[PDB]
């Protein structure tokens, strides 16, 4: 990352582009509830945090680790974009969430 864009811009980021590498474990009733809230009161749902990482060959890679239930709600609503904050990050920050499953990002 040559740049930085601080300290709080919000973007409509495509679900088709989010890597969600961690096994979700979801309270379905909470998912079912968040769905009602996004449909009818979307501004009251705070945006998720998305890690933006540069690949060795300059590829853009976007990780989502949090807002598990928000994400699922959005998947239930079949939206193609979710409000996110983009947090620029390194590889070594991944290995903290990924351990030996940490890929070699091209």
């Amino acid at each position: 990352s040559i740049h930085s864009g601080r300290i709080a811009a919000v973007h409509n980021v495509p679900l088709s582009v989010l890597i969600r590498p961690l096994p979700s474990v979801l309270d379905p009733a909470k998912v079912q509830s968040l769905v009602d809230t996004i449909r009818e009161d979307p501004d009251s749902v705070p945006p998720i945090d998305v890690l933006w990482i540069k690949g060795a060959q300059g590829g853009d890679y976007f990780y989502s680790f949090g807002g598990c239930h928000r994400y699922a709600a959005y998947q239930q609503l079949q939206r193609e974009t979710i409000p996110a904050k983009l947090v620029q990050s390194t590889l070594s920050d991944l290995r903290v969430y990924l351990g030996a499953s940490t890929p070699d990002l091209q």
Partner: protein
């Protein structure tokens, strides 16, 4: 795993823990002697992972309560970090009020004493230890960072060790073979 040896007493420890109430209290694994303790590590306090794992042990503390058991969690982050994490509402990316103590291990020694510190990072793997009422280590589970632990499987283990614990208050059957014990 580290010093922790199954069948042998559990590697004692004494650290400052954030209790369910909001207050600090220096405590030790001895203090729970007389209860089965489930003791579990987790990597960091302001994870970008939805902490659904810890929330799950906290949420279901009554299930453990009903089994004369005390769930304690732990990380390398400071006790002030813990506080702050409990005082950040779940939805804002936090813990909210917690039903289970949280140990802090900034010297990374309790992690080391359990064999669950990964040198590279200076943090704990998702390790979990089930100790009995007589302070003996009874089972060890350690997970690479990506995968979580089941509350259901922890309960299932706890109950099972209690089941066999609960025999052995047994005594001579007042029975003897034989005959007329022998079978045609």
């Amino acid at each position: 795993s580290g010093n922790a040896k199954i069948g042998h007493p559990a590697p004692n420890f004494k650290a400052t823990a954030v209790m369910p109430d909001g207050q600090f209290k220096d405590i030790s694994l001895s203090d729970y002697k007389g209860k089965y303790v489930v003791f579990f590590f987790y990597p960091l306090d302001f994870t970008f992972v939805c902490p659904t794992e810890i929330i799950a042990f906290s949420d279901r503390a009554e299930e453990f309560k009903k089994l004369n058991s005390q769930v304690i969690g732990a990380s390398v982050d400071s006790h002030f970090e813990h506080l702050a994490w409990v005082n950040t509402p779940k939805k804002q990316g936090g813990l909210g009020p917690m039903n289970i103590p949280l140990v802090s291990d900034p010297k990374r020694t309790i992690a080391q004493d359990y064999g669950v510190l990964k040198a590279d990072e200076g943090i704990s793997f998702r390790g979990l230890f089930i100790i009995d009422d007589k302070g003996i280590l009874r089972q060890i589970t350690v997970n690479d960072l990506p995968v979580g632990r089941s509350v259901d499987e922890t309960l299932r283990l706890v109950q099972a060790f209690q089941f066999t614990d609960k025999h052995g208050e047994v005594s001579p059957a007042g029975w003897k073979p034989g005959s007329d014990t022998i079978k045609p």
